[PDB]
Design a protein around this nucleic acid. Sequence first.
DNA 1: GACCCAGT
DNA 2: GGGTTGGGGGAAGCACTGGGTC
Lengths: 335, 336, 240, 333, 107, 108
Amino acid sequence: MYVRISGRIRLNAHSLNAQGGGGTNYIEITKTKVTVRTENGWTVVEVPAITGNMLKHWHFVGFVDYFKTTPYGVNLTERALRYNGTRFGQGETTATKANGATVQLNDEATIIKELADADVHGFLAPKTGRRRVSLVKASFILPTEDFIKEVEGERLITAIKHNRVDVDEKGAIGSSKEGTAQMLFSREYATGLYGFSIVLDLGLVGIPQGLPVKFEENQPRPNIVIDPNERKARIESALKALIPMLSGYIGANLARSFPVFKVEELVAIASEGPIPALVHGFYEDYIEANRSIIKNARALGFNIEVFTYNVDLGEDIEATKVSSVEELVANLVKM
Amino acid sequence: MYVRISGRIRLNAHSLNAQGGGGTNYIEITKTKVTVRTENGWTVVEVPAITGNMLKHWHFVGFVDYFKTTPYGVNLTERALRYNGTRFGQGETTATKANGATVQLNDEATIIKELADADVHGFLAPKTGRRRVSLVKASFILPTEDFIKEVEGERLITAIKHNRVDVDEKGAIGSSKEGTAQMLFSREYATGLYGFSIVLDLGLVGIPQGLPVKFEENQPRPNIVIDPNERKARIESALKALIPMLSGYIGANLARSFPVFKVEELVAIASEGPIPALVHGFYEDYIEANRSIIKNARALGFNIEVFTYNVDLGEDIEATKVSSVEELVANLVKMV
Amino acid sequence: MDILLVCLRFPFFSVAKRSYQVRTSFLLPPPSALKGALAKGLILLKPEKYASSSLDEAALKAIKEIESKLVDIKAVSVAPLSPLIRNAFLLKRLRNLESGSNAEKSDAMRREYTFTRELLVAYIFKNLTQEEKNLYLKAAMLIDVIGDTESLATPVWASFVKPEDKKAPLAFSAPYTEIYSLRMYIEKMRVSPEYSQEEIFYLPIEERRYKRIVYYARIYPPEVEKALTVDGEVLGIWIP
Amino acid sequence: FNEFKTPQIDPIFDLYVAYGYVVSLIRGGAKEATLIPHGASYLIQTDVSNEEFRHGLVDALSSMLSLHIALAKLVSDADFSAGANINNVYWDSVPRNLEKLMKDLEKKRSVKGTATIPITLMPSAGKYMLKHFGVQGGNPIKVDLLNYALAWVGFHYYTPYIKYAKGDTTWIHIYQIAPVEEVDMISILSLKDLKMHLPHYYESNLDFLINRRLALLYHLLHSEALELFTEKEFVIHSYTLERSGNNQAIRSFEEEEIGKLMDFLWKLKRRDFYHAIKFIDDLLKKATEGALALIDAIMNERLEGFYTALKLGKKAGVVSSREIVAALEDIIC
Amino acid sequence: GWIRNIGRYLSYLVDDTFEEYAYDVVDGIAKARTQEELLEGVYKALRLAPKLKKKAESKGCPPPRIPSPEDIEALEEKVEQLSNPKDLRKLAVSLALWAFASWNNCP
Amino acid sequence: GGWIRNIGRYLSYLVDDTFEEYAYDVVDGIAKARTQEELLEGVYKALRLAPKLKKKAESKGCPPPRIPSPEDIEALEEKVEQLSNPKDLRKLAVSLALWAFASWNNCP
DNA sequence: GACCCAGT
DNA sequence: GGGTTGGGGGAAGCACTGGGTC
């Protein structure tokens, strides 16, 4: 419904956010800078960070994977199955579904009903406007400065060479004229302890933002312009899309790197209505600050349920001891 | 049909993944920095590691060997039989079939209908422009955290010099300018409680990315290009390609290193559907994590098939006590 | 005079200036982005008043209401308490919004951002009534995402403060229109968004290197009679 | 005191146009001048008349036309013609504007036309902007000739660039120093010495020019310019114009600082000079992938970088002089 | 600084004039972090004294000079109170850095 | 502190020349050991060759080697019992073996 | 929206 | 301990959707 997950992740030796390889041979991994407070001053370090676009793309990938399980897989665009993510264009008005059905762009009511991918991440149509805000938002995957405080150095960038062997008509090796594909390139993999934070907005699934409520009987109720039974199924299709994140399906080079992924600690809040995000998995004061933010939301009248994984988070909060992401989802799918 | 294998391996005495070049003496082993605790903060420690590229290449090598015995083995790339992983490199507009035929490069499905290599490890078509996502995803090979915590990283690398005996016909080895290509080179070998987390996605075999479904009467049906019996045989061959992974065919240099192996604790999950990946064995306290990843996921409505070895689990789920990986894949090929 | 001060500890920036290939970003968040982030919070929280056919007028009416409840054109100011640093990111920005060039036309653009550790946001009002004071207090929080849909911001707290004419040098941003006596630092800031004007603001950023790095330190402009104190660290606010 | 006004458009374009003001006032004298930084405005404070400003521009453009016509619709091989220019349409359009002022500035007439800025002087330019919905046609960023001519004069002389083609593809890396706290005629004129005219290396032996962060070291190595950065403060801004397979696009754009690199080279090349350049050139040419570990250790003071590069380079060929080893520990201690 | 008189011996096992080419000890000493492998790695380098003694005489140059024990204790007395990796690497990396020199004494 | 140099001087006479005695096995075993028990075994094996070297040096013209003082035996004995963890055991295992190779003026 | 271009 | 060899050559990103004009 309204779930905010965050925490710290320990993944190392992973090739994420490379520089392509159009002509550059040494494929150096992206390098970032972070500031950290020490000895009454601020210092920076050349440490890699992963953008959240990888996280959003993997959410899109997992959405269709968990959407094809239910018999409601008809309502899905063809481009979603090929991992396109273009969402129409400046002049594209018709839609390409799995069965080839045509969709007319007039309002979100006839779009979020016949199509499901266009609602989770939104779309745009400059010909007729009608822009849809992405319901799912990702965060940049960057290493915490606690790791820098305990390291403040070291290479932490594993540069390994990889070779692509090639054969001729009989097993010969060419240099520049025999028509060979022999190549010897480099790959840098990143290490360290990073942080993650994902927000989900399942309350707008099937409810247009322009008219969120019905408002014809003096009783504001959600304007579910789609069928409720399949709306509930769509809830889980996006809720389980974050399960592959907590398993290793992050970034690229999964066939050759497959990051060594295991979450050490996380905190989440689940609620029926809109709720603030707790903290990014970066700052050292990411526990007690959350201990504050909860009491900053309970006094406002929010029925927030806190789920904790490998964190005490004090004792007054009625948090639930979570041991993995899957039972968190299982405890969220009911509501 | 997605299957996840994850576990440990006492892989040692191996010069795998070596950084060296023709004009580069002292061929040395790959070293990957990792994050550990050592009863203190998340410190960083150096340790040798193995790349997932290698594992992917050796999975290709095993897959082609196990696909040779299949009656449909003729439907494979000729270069694949040559123990070469160059799937549609640069310099050619088409590949060569095993029988000597070629492959046409406009449609994605017609590439994999007569070829079982791009349908099992992906491909890239530079000149044409199209591409396919990979099937099998291999993880790096890293030792257990507690293993390097207890030994606090004492070298863990053994450098051995090797030479040859390239003596002339007369029976004398004199000068380099003499013509004796004979010399001293060093190889680095490593040990540790390594771990792997290989995953295979057999639900995408024979399914082109451009047109994965047909929906001719508006029904759930992925667009398969190959015969269902052919698809079953290819899936069985892919599953059988897992035995050489633990059978010592982890990496190259087997002619001179051939690392020692033993079946440690393993966990395999497969239920013929979208399945999350497992937890890597690099972390010492991962077993308890496996007691929470699939504990309630079974109650979600998935008929998760779990095969475990050298672990008692939480003695509450239907975890089959499989003997070795060959029985594990035998139990997987019988449900497809 | 009441000032609503909140804290946003978001690592990486989200705003991108008018640029192609590279995506230059502001050193401090633009007022237009903050206006949008606060306006979008009133729709999903109070949908019984924001009734619109589409998003185009939905944003316009919210911005009009925010400007109406505002003292002047100046929307909202920010205060950096951490050394800003200009990072470098390479993202995918597909170019397929023209009448042609098929459907899939995507290449890599360097969409780089800015990193900070601590930041304050000070909204200004004209002593509003109580019945909407609580509504705006609740709306100040729940700012999960700012700028684009790839970076998340996390609010910390929200409280009202009085100027009381305390002695403290200016710390938040101020427009460069009539302030000359206040090393001076002004850029295009775009306080007012457009939906189919451009004012110049003074930004408290200065580069100081001690022995290794330059970052962006504090310029400490001359003291302004208007200021607000919080958590011991008092900061100077410019009020017209 | 005149305080020539400088329009604010782009943080990088304004750097080029305002920082190029000095090359004209030097030709016209302008004693006791200064440049007050503003982050992006970078305003010049000089007590000089406006008349000599055009006398500076006419001499600067005479030098530009003399350089352009010497080499060879006519396309030269200079910085402003084909060196840093990645687009061929600007190979002849840009010089045409430069000579156009010869019909405007000589007889004391103000500019009336308005040209289109290419991407080389300002990377934020392009063809597809976003205003409210969708994109537009052409380049909406249109720059007046007055500010247009003031950018190339500062670009050719002051900011250096490195070009490495390798046949069809082409990599162009542009670096420039931007003052951030104070600056005077001593520093801005010294930065002019860093410019590499005709940096066309090609062949295959000189491949070390791969990556911008590695090309900057090679550019800096053979230029032992003024070392005032040990007491001053300056920032390096760099951008790339990749043309891999005749595909003009920018794929690398990072912000770094040059002061620590200044200090590193100043502390390195002090005990001896004959062997330091030989050592660094050998590691750059042979240890292509290893010099990245050396350059990365400079902006973060990484201890393992000072060893990994040497380890990877010694295996191929390294002189490994004695006096330079003691130079590293001077930074280390 | 008790470094110039010990780095030249470490350089004896990398230079081309002495073809034995043992980088394992240099790799071990370069990646020494906690308390012990720094003292263990330097043992391997200091052990291969005969090698150099015979190799210098095999060509004509005088035998190399073995470092004096007048300053070896400066490492043991410094590694004790510098237990943390904060400043221990600060000299451990320099120990391996001084191993990559020429010291042309065998023409 | 103080006894390390004295024991290293004794260990130097086993690897230096002008003695026709080269036994690296024991000095290798002392340093790169794994368990505390074999440390004293290696120390005994190194120390056993005291009388055979205390007499040949003067016959060859070299000054007699200085036998380590018995007080240092007390220190090396009393240092090892309280330190049983292998974390900081290898450092002392190699500290005394380091001084075996040095510039001691055995035969001036 | 169809045109443009380079040298060792 | 007393001599012979320290890499050897080959590869060390192709294609791929170029972005400006007019």
